[PDB]
Amino acid sequence: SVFSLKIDIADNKFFNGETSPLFSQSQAKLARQFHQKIAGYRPTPLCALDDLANLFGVKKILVKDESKRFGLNAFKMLGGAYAIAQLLCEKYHLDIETLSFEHLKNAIGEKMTFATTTDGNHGRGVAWAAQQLGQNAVIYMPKGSAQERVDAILNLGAECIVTDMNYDDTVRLTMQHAQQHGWEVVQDTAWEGYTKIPTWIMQGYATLADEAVEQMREMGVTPTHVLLQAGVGAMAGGVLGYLVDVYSPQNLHSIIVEPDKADCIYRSGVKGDIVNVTIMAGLACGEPNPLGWEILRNCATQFISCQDSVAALGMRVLGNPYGNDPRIISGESGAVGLGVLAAVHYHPQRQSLMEKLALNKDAVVLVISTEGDTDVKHYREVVWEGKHAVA
Template sequence: MTDTTVTRWVANDRSTTWSSPDSDDAALSFHRGLEGYEPTALIALPELARELGVAAVFAKDESTRLGLPAFKALGASWAVHRALEAHQAGTDAEVVTATDGNHGRAVARFARKAGHPARIFVPAGGIHPSAVAAIRGEDAEVVEVDAGYDQTVAAAADYAAGSAGVLVQDTAWDGYEEVPGWIVDGYSTLFREIDSQLREAGRASPDLICVPTGVGSLLQAALAHYRRAEADSDQGGEGSGTAVVSVEPDSAACMGPSLAEGRPVSVATGQTIMSGLNCGSPSSLAWPLISNGLDAAVTVSETAAIEAAHRLADLGIAAGPCGAASLAGVRESLTGDDRVSRRRHLGVDSDSVIVLTITEGAEANPVPEA
């Protein structure tokens, strides 16, 4: 465990020739077959474009994803399906996970739909009481662990191993990478939708996308998508493409220190209203894509996330603190100290298109008053 001084911005001088493997459409096809599936809205925000000095800003609003108020439904639905199939689990097999936010409710929802009980481990006092109530509302057993997120994940893994439960965790470690990989594959649907929606709006791929980041699974999905050789070709050839920035709370920021050290670094975490991002260790599965494909890591304060949430609410988007962190991260990157050099590093100018990934709605995690 590393105790680090928080640095708000860490640039990564990635290789512009590196690319991730192309992926198939299996997860997207699965999602399209689910009851209630439809692409979430991509909302143009011209007011923010003017404020940030760019051509366009869009918000990908995940507050209504498959009947749940967060993007986690994409990864959980696909991973629960694949894990139960792979384990040939009987109907009494318990689906197990740890969560500091919306992942647990999503796992519980799709376990229930598949006819299986669920046991969800949560850090005691680490997530909003309404989120705990929502998990219980999916008929799941909730186990509160008097420890931080990383220790809660370990407790869930130990329980699943000892009970023959089916662990569906979005954190990867050595020896546990297949299921987290399915979760990442599920998240790819979000970025495929963005591509299609931008084309319908007469735009190409975004020049910059900001991704609220916990252990890094959604970030991994973004990098897998935007660093494909096919994507690079579509966007104009070698070295071009979408700049990707991770956004973390300054009380739980492991991506910047990891980039600075050139290896995954675990950090001590504190309390944050961005509970879904309160993670101190990068996923081992995500790290190769982060180190090779991420453009920068930025951290944001509680105040910045709250202010961003209220600004989005003024524009008609009810974002929770984690979702609003995307806007807070863009503001820190493009309008804060050293903004000229940061814009240059990201390739952002007055013609740029920015996408904010609004990963959760206010229903999932209420926003305090400013």
């Protein structure tokens, strides 16, 4: 009934409201015009959870269901595929606004090999895009990675190698093999000497944000809040950067949500610079994304560091909705944002927590469900077996 899950809320002291022309409206619209051309494109549902909002004491909760993003069960292709197409156009002297998928898929000549490390969705997007554009993909995964996710990459004609090292140590192996064999590294994070690719990725991600805005205008509503789950901060940066260019950073109460075992952005928001940090697949960090960090440091209202089981709570609430609300299949990393709202509601200190997050009877909350049931074994263990329960 009433229960306490670790919810740490910290105000962003380093907020200045400086927007980014690099990650704004214009780039997202260009990126979406690329996605519109892909076969089977459809804006993912923005589900209105009216009855859950009434229970939580807010006006509306809106969930962007990225499990419907093609047949990928996750949002990540929006960035990965866009970056891969841009690399193709740069190296093979082509224009992005006039690319043919059947042209590259069938044609002969020089083949690119895209190398990346993933714990799930990113590498699947990279593998997908490589298959669609007739290229090669070598995807590395850390120890303890789910076989279903490995199989999903293999079913896209990509090479997939499971190592006995952790994520961070697997990334370096991908890099060392890439320079050795002449592979092109496609990571969803930035470092010194590597910002081109992750920029396109974040611009690509913002398609969902452009879709969301269009759908919220269709509903005739203006969002007051947005929760964004952050691993390295690539999605949060890209999506917030777009949303902030639409609604202004001062009039959007943005909340960044992280698990407390890898809360890299949270710890960075405390110190004021980059802090280095097993966890839920998708939200692993190690070290924050500089391009994403620049957005959040400037425009994020609050950072949240929360207990693991908050994500599990979100999965169940979305999978078994309240009242007559539509049902959403949401994976562990995809539900943690929604999980926060539920953990606050059932908390003993509900009132003071809602006060801090500026949540009231007028609040209109945007929520992003980043993935569906990418690991069905885990998903059903949570929703049916009650794994990672409350008490």
